[PDB]
Design a protein around this ligand. Structure first.
Ligand SMILES: [Mg+2]
Ligand SMILES: [Mg+2]
Ligand SMILES: [Mg+2]
Ligand SMILES: [Mg+2]
Ligand SMILES: [Mg+2]
Ligand SMILES: [Mg+2]
Ligand SMILES: [Mg+2]
Ligand SMILES: [Mg+2]
Ligand SMILES: [Mg+2]
Ligand SMILES: [Mg+2]
Ligand SMILES: [Mg+2]
Ligand SMILES: [Mg+2]
Ligand SMILES: [Mg+2]
Ligand SMILES: [Mg+2]
Ligand SMILES: [Mg+2]
Ligand SMILES: [Mg+2]
Ligand SMILES: [Mg+2]
Ligand SMILES: [Mg+2]
Ligand SMILES: [Mg+2]
Ligand SMILES: [Mg+2]
Ligand SMILES: [Mg+2]
Ligand SMILES: [Mg+2]
Ligand SMILES: [Mg+2]
Ligand SMILES: [Mg+2]
Ligand SMILES: [Mg+2]
Lengths: 52, 104, 128, 147, 187
RNA sequence: GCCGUCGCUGGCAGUCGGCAGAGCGAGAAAGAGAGUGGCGCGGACGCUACGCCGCGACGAGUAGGAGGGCCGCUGCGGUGAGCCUUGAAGCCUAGGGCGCGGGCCCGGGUGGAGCCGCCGCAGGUGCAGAUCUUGGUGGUAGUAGCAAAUAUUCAAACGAG
RNA sequence: UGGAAUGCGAGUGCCUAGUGGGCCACUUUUGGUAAGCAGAACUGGCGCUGCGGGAUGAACCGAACGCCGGGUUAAGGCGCC
């Protein structure tokens, strides 16, 4: 129930949103994985520019 | 089931906890709700106030001159009284010396 | 022949009985540790006459004799000789209590040192 | 941290601070914004006038890029250039006026709030406001339209 | 029994800064002594404001300080603000000021100093003006906050120009019924 | 008399010492002012200023709000040159005490390998109830009872019986 | 000559829980034969509140409450309990 002044809010949590929460604890691992693949690609194609 | 319908019991007790405060009074009230025709002219009266600015200065200085000129022409018991005089820290400063000097 | 405090005023206790919890005499599951009764009908809470008494700040002890031991000192727990030397300059008002978990070997050093420094020990004859 | 919150102070107090009469029940009054036109009407009309009904035209497939038009007032115009630009032009004798290109600073329309320093300037912009154009002209400046 | 109410016994007011900053409290120690041991009410007012919260210590813009320090009779006085002196790009020429503040923004320092002015700290003001003589105490706008737009009569009451709380602003967001006569009513 | 709260948005940085001089409570604004002419080597405490000190008033409380906890539980970062097989945690105790209290300390016993103080951080953090959950134990109580369908007796053997 | 007495420091803003079953007494008062009935006004109470008296008692009378010593009282009492 509304209480005094406030904002009217419509949160989109009327589904089973907990079934589909994407956490980001693998983020540092992803950053290491992508960096390890950039270095391994730069070595493979050297002396061609790494950027592409 | 049935219940109570209406009452004002306990209501004047609640009203007076923070006091039945009278409305706040300011020396300038809002012109809201006054006659539109009269308000239109009052705005016009204010709008041209500055037209007679120089005339007002002359009269005010002239009035001040006359006002200043007129000015420049124009300009319980005798024992307890005495004791109350001596006991005064300033007024009785010399009197207290007199009794002390005589005492010596 | 024990060390004496700088002063020994009279200690006044507004109360000496402990405050026992309501109904703690009727059940074993209710310990005697005080709990503020909060029942709607609780006759202890409403301060009926002849009922269990509730603690309140009025029973507070005089600031001048609060925490003061019967000997007139105030205790200070110590665990070793280094902790004991803080009481060097307040040895007429604060005594030393050796913590229970200090081995008998270490007590002798503390008890001996306190004698040199004129610090009083509340439990000098323990674990001998 | 949960050690600084009421729950730690409501231990041993029956009702946990929700009252003995009304209690804490699940959803008295409805869930979310239920009751707007009903038992919750006073709140909505008192604090959210206009909440109910429809006003104006619909626009399908709005693209907010098309209306992109950042604006800048005249009181901030000279901040788009370096400090030494304004002092050098203030103290030059040829009368050469510096060019201020608002689009380079990320603005498209120039607005007229404020006053300009008494100093000629050439302003470029996609759009100008009337009072902005007069104020820029009042100090001997010129308005230049870009696309 | 005595017939008296006790709901107003305890006055609500700060006796010290909620802030744990040790430099703020060193100034509070300094001005606690000055407020106590001098008959100056300027010392008392400054002491009070060191306790005040962030929203009771609004920042003073450079333009506003110049405007208030340009009034007649205020030449060669020290502007004193218990707060932050922000910069105002809308100003063109900065005169020579002498200011005392808790903070001065990086760009406001260069502008004040470049014009020949002086920036004091409240410990330097005490040595310069122990009683607060020759000062001009200044405050930032207190109602200069987005919150005060939302206070007053509720937006849905006659002649209530209060700002409502809307998640988004647009034609579809609290403009239909109660805000025009065409939809129900207006007030 | 003592405890606490509130108020005086009260007082104390002046411990200004032999590079000294002891005051600022007093009915009644503003200077214990500055100048120019007419033997001994001494003098308590204090002040964690988040501290210390003074004076006056006051103190009921459900629902509810707030503050303060050197109240208590578990784990993390720091710290205690911390405690501990010369005995940790735990547990018991007609032992000695502390605190208004939440609780805590010490003595004695048992135990056998870990544990706690302080500054911060964190929480699956405090039970008398919920016909609460699971486990255990009572009184009832040596009680109800061991009563449907006719029935057993004598002698001997084995055997501790 | 701050223009009656008396007393008293005031103003102002945010955020806000619980509550939204009440009930009782003097006086006034509607319905009803009346009700420890139903319904109102005013104030005060109980609810939320102990304490002395009414033997006993939500509301009556006195009086409101920090922990104590002395003194004196209120309403009530002083054959014995
Ligand atoms: Mg609510
Ligand atoms: Mg009702
Ligand atoms: Mg009750
Ligand atoms: Mg409560
Ligand atoms: Mg409940
Ligand atoms: Mg609540
Ligand atoms: Mg409710
Ligand atoms: Mg209800
Ligand atoms: Mg809820
Ligand atoms: Mg009282
Ligand atoms: Mg009260
Ligand atoms: Mg209050
Ligand atoms: Mg109270
Ligand atoms: Mg026992
Ligand atoms: Mg083992
Ligand atoms: Mg856990
Ligand atoms: Mg249990
Ligand atoms: Mg039988
Ligand atoms: Mg059978
Ligand atoms: Mg009735
Ligand atoms: Mg109730
Ligand atoms: Mg009440
Ligand atoms: Mg009562
Ligand atoms: Mg009777
Ligand atoms: Mg008495």
């Amino acid at each position: 129930a509304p209480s005094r002044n406030g904002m009217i809010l419509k949160p989109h949590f009327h589904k089973d949103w907990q079934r589909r929460v994407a956490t980001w604890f693998n983020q540092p691992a992803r950053k290491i994985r992508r960096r390890k693949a950039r270095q391994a690609r730069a070595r493979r194609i050297a002396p061609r520019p790494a950027a592409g | 089931a049935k219940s109570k319908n209406h009452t004002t019991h306990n209501q004047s007790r609640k009203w007076h906890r923070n006091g039945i405060k009278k409305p706040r009074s300011q020396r300038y009230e809002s012109l809201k709700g006054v006659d539109p025709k009269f308000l239109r002219n009052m705005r016009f009266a204010k709008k041209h106030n500055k037209k007679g600015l120089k005339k007002m200065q002359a009269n005010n200085a002239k009035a001040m001159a006359a006002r200043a000129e007129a000015i420049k022409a124009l300009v319980v018991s005798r024992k307890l009284h005495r004791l109350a005089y001596i006991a005064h820290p300033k007024l009785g400063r010399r009197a207290r010396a007199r009794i002390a000097r005589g005492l010596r | 022949a024990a060390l004496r405090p700088l002063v020994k005023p009279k200690i006044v206790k507004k109360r000496t009985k402990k405050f026992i919890r309501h109904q703690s005499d009727r059940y074993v599951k209710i310990k005697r540790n005080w709990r503020k009764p909060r029942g709607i009908d609780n006759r202890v809470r409403r301060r009926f006459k002849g009922q269990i008494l509730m603690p309140n700040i009025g029973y507070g002890s005089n600031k001048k004799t609060k925490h003061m031991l019967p000997s007139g000192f105030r205790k200070f727990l110590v665990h070793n000789v280094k902790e004991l030397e803080v009481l060097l300059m307040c040895n007429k008002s604060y005594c030393a209590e050796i913590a229970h978990n200090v081995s008998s070997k270490n007590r002798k050093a503390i008890v001996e040192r306190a004698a040199q420094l004129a610090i009083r020990v509340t439990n000098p004859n323990a674990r001998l | 941290p949960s050690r600084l919150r009421k729950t730690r102070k409501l231990r041993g107090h029956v009702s946990h601070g929700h009252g003995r009469i009304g209690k804490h029940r699940k959803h008295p009054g409805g869930r979310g914004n239920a009751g707007g036109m009903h038992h919750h009407r006073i709140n909505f009309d008192k604090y959210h006038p206009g909440y109910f009904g429809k006003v104006g035209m619909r626009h399908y497939h709005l693209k907010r890029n098309q209306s992109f038009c950042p604006t800048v007032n005249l009181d901030k115009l000279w901040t788009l250039v370096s400090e030494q630009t304004r002092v050098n032009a203030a103290k030059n004798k040829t009368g050469a006026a510096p060019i201020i290109d608002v689009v380079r600073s990320g603005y498209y329309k120039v607005l007229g709030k404020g006053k300009l320093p008494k100093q000629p300037v050439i302003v470029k912009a996609k759009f100008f406001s009337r009072r902005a154009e007069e104020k820029i002209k009042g100090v001997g400046g010129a308005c230049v339209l870009v696309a | 029994g005595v017939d008296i109410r006790h709901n107003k016994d305890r006055k609500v007011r700060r006796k010290e800064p909620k802030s744990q900053d040790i430099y703020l409290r060193l100034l509070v120690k300094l001005y606690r002594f000055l407020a106590r041991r001098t008959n100056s009410t300027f010392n008392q007012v400054v002491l009070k404001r060191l306790f005040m919260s962030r929203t009771n210590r609004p920042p003073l813009s450079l333009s506003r300080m110049i405007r208030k320090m340009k009034l007649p009779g205020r030449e060669n006085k020290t502007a004193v603000v218990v707060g932050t002196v922000t910069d105002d790009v809308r100003v063109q020429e900065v005169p020579k000021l002498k200011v005392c503040a808790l903070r001065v923004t990086s760009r406001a320092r260069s502008r004040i100093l470049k014009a020949g002015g002086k920036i004091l700290t409240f410990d330097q003001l005490a040595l310069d003006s122990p009683k607060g003589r020759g000062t001009v105490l200044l405050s930032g706008p207190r109602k200069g906050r987005e919150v005060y737009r939302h206070f007053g009569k509720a937006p849905g009451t006659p002649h209530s120009h209060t700002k409502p709380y809307v998640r988004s602003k647009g034609r579809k967001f609290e403009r239909a019924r109660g805000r025009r006569a065409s939809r129900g009513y207006k007030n």
